[PDB]
Amino acid sequence: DLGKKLLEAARAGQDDEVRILLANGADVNTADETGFTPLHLAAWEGHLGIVEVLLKNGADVNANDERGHTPLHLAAYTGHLEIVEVLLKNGAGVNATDVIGTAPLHLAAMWGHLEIVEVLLKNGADVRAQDKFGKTPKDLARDNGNEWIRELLEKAERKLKDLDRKLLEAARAGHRDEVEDLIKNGADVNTADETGFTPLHLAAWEGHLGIVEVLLKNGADVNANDERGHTPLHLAAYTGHLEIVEVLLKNGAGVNATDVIGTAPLHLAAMWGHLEIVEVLLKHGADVNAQDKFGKTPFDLAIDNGNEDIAEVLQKAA
């Protein structure tokens, strides 16, 4: 019974009653049938004093209702700026998503709460977050005619695109500290250039081992395909970067991936004379019988190109 009274007092804005109920043992994190806590209801109705009292007494700032909405979602939707600021100060998750993929920034942008948008952005909100329909917050601002917010979010996305371009260049050039700084300031490790090369492609091609490792640790797709089907492992096998081959395989690289010509990493290592790489690829399950579009196996290429030691290794594995 205490829990129900606290929910109602919080919803009704009964500041004195909230304090008494808490003093008498009401559970600050009690939840109604749909998972709303007193903090949800105070944030939704705009009762700043009660929000602060609930947080002072142990309220879970990131409590989820049964569909994933947090108190920050509700304050962002209803446009309660000071409550947004208090929630964030008490640890609210600025990028939390409900079961539809909707984050607080989606709601502030859709419902035209500019100062809340600006506060969410200052607190780390992700302008690239897409809901289940594929909408970013900018998309919703545009669709709903909130042009000032749309323009603000467009500028923010253009700054991230610039960071993405610098990340490609730093990864190609081997500037490790620049790579790490760019990732920390929000560069997308899975960005790709016009031909489909990602930072991981460029680092593997240029033999930048440390950068390969940093990119994979920050979530880079080990099996990303460029526009012709080449993966990072293709490029490391071609250029002969043995340690990078081993890191890629350790991180899940597909050992038998083929480009649009049917060329696999083993073809490239055998053709270009990289014996240790051939051996590592065989150890990880490379397919000696794979034929490219010309009908050539890796053994065929080793024979055609005079790589006798490799030809013998591949016959042993026939």
Residue numbers in the entry: 13 to 330
Per the authors:
In this paper, we present a strategy to fuse specific, high-affinity protein binders to obtain multivalent or multispecific scaffolds of predetermined geometry. DARPins are used as building blocks to confer the desired specificity to the construct. A series of rigid connector modules replacing the DARPin capping repeats allow to combine the individual DARPin domains in such a way that their distance and angle can be altered to test different geometries, bringing the binding partners of the DARPins into a defined spatial arrangement. The two helices are not just joined end-to-end, but instead the two domains are made to overlap in such a way that the joining helix is stabilized by contacts with the domain cores along its entire length.
In the context of DARPin-β-lactamase fusions, we observed that the paratope of this DARPin has a high propensity to form major crystal contacts, leading to crystal formation under a wide variety of conditions. Indeed, constructs D12_Hxx_D12 with H02, H09, H11, H13 and H15 yielded diffraction-quality crystals in space groups P212121, P6122, P212121, C2 and P1, respectively, at resolutions ranging from 1.8 Å to 3.5 Å. Indeed, in the majority of the D12-containing structures analyzed in this study, the D12 paratope-paratope interaction provided the largest crystal contact, with a total of around 1700 Å2 of solvent-accessible surface buried in the interface. D12_H15_D12 makes paratope-paratope contacts of this type both within the asymmetric unit and with symmetry-related molecules. Five out of nine DD structures showed good agreement between design and experimental crystal structure with root mean squares deviation (rmsds) of the Cα atoms below 2 Å. This confirms the design strategy and validates the concept of a shared helix as a rigid connector.
